[PDB]
TrEMBL record, chains A, B:
UniProt cross-references to Gene3D superfamilies, sorted A to Z: Hotdog Thioesterase
Keywords: Cytoplasm, Lipid A biosynthesis, Lipid biosynthesis, Lipid metabolism, Lyase
Pfam families for the chain: FabA
Major subcellular site: cytoplasm
Gene Ontology cellular component annotations, sorted alphabetically: cytoplasm; membrane
GO molecular function, one term: (3R)-hydroxyacyl-[acyl-carrier-protein] dehydratase activity
Cellular localisation: Cytoplasm
Protein name, UniProt field: 3-hydroxyacyl-[acyl-carrier-protein] dehydratase
Enzyme Commission number(s): 4.2.1.59
InterPro entries (alphabetical): FabA_FabZ, HotDog_dom_sf
Gene that this sequence comes from: fabZ
Functional summary from the UniProt entry: Involved in unsaturated fatty acids biosynthesis. Catalyzes the dehydration of short chain beta-hydroxyacyl-ACPs and long chain saturated and unsaturated beta-hydroxyacyl-ACPs.
Any one GO biological process: lipid A biosynthetic process
From TrEMBL, chains C, F:
Taxonomic path: Bacteria, Pseudomonadati, Planctomycetota, Candidatus Brocadiia, Candidatus Brocadiales
Organism per entry: Kuenenia stuttgartiensis
Physiological role: Involved in unsaturated fatty acids biosynthesis. Catalyzes the dehydration of short chain beta-hydroxyacyl-ACPs and long chain saturated and unsaturated beta-hydroxyacyl-ACPs.
Protein name per the record: 3-hydroxyacyl-[acyl-carrier-protein] dehydratase
The keyword Lyase belongs to this UniProt entry's keyword annotation: yes
Domain of life assignment: Bacteria
EC number: 4.2.1.59
Length: 138, 138, 138, 138, 138, 138
């Protein structure tokens, strides 16, 4: 799944896109996606001026956007719960995020997912995410 | 504590500043800070084009930056653990985030904190955050 | 009037939105709008890098956009044609709220005239008398 | 100039006369940040930003001779014509008085021959006493 | 132009000759995004972006007469002189052949009289067969 | 060579950084660098909004910045003076890695000449012959 199938699948547009390509896809349980970390991205100007590192909260969003792509390839998604999120290794410009998402429930008008992010072949982040589904509440 | 005492206290610079002012401060246990949500911020262009809402991961960063200000008014801080993070109400341009941070441990080369964010006087987010302290590991 | 109406009513989009919501509005006589000043806005990296002040000219645009909301919720690119008695007193910085008051004095003569006073919590910081012009499709 | 991008509005000063007169040229183009949202329908230079080109042409004089000069009074400002990418401003500022900790000037902005705007500006002279002043206001 | 900001490099086409020649003007200023980092020491228009002004002046011809024309060959390109804010490019493009699904042109860029750059460009003509082509490459 | 050396060695800072790291480097003969193409980069919102392609000219700059790393780890604003035999074949999109190979042919004659070939996974997508110039402090 190339980047521009991803664009209309994601409601997010720049500056808040964190998915570049999807390698694997199991229709409603599993997906893996790729995020290229390049020094030319906007967040690296201020985080940090001295040392460029991907913020941990943006890795969670990279987990969440990979979940939304799975969900909307599977027949507004707001992240509502973050549990057991662990951040292990610094993420540097030049790395590729291999973002893994496993589905745990799609039954509570929302979704519990459990995600694992890896650089070349070693884990750098994990989290258990839960979303909520709303559309123009008013 | 006005915005430009905050600037040198925070290692983050735009586009990744989420603290505008600190109202209260207890030297090493408690702080409250303010974040103004304005539609002219860069994240609202792509999140979302149809409906402007503050992402949940950026509220966690607003919690984390309020913790760093407490820590560096108290004699590189990387967020390493997110636990029990709950997101309750949508955050809209025009709202003020009253970010609360309570300190739980500063004893593990890092810090466990437990944060509560509120709009006018009602809770919209909470989280238990844990950081790690590194400086030019090489 | 919340921000999603503000954004559909204003012809200005980012990076030139200076109204976040309206709190009191009465049908072609008087309106009051709120602008949150945030340190994460795009103008503050340049004005100034040394000391972040809301530019005075952009307070005038905030006065202008507030009455465009008033002009247009009242039965087109409204462009500024004249400014008289523009007085600015106190620097407004990130962390402040601008309560923008606009009072109509004369409406369309192919252009409208308004008196506007901007305040921080209740101390006056800017006031001006604005006249706009209504437009072609040249 | 004390400012940088995104809020720099001068490129060249063609004629400099020690203490009372300059002519400056800021020149308009499509890649400036303001035209992305003002307007998406079609690009016009905002009238308030034309006032900056006047104020910045002023402040270049007052410290190329004889250094944050905040905008204090804008009287008799008329915006006769729209400014469009491809055009080139030709800002002339005549100093009228250096009365006290401020200065009154008369500015006229010109495109190739026609006159598109004029204003009468008055500023205020401080650098860093200004901080504690801004501290005392809060 | 198929592009928008931050990658628009034309403002006015002064002379248009149906199928073989234009002269265009992109004009340089300090508020363009490229000069924030090229260079922080002092601002020079990158030579590769001057090639865009040539290529965009070309592509305006080929569809103002007779619509994504990707850059395929850049031969004999010389950058004699630096381009600085305040300057104004004057891009001339002579069409030499519309051979097949592409076009060979000779461009010369001029500041007030002197010549700052020239190049010989060749493009490729597709719109949307280009997607599945890009799909087949992956 | 990781990114923090890349950023101190390159004179180009954002938004004009096009090298993320170097993987093999040998002292004034040959260098190989890596560029991650991400959909969250600033150029892709404008080139194109319809279809995100890495501009060909910025691949040349990536060739140029890679050899500036090579020129400067080998005992100043290196500016592009000539481009010959620039051939571009395949569109490179977000999700791809650019493996930038540069080979020195002649070093400082007040300028250097290099042959550069850029690749995606191993298929060649861009190649050029670059000559730069070393500079004044005009």
């Amino acid at each position: 799944v190339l980047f521009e199938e991803i664009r209309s699948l994601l409601p997010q547009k720049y500056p808040f896109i964190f998915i570049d390509r999807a390698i694997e896809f199991e229709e409603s349980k599993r997906i893996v996606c790729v995020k290229n970390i390049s020094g030319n991205e906007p967040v690296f100007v201020g985080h940090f001026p001295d040392f460029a590192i991907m913020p941990g909260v943006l890795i969670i969003e990279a987990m969440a956007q990979a979940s939304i792509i799975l969900f909307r390839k599977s027949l507004v998604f707001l992240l509502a719960s973050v549990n057991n999120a662990r951040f292990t290794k610094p993420v540097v410009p030049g790395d590729q995020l291999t973002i893994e998402v496993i589905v745990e429930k799609i039954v509570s008008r929302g979704a519990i997912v459990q995600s694992v992010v890896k650089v070349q072949e070693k884990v750098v982040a994990k989290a258990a995410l839960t979303f909520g589904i709303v559309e123009k509440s008013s």
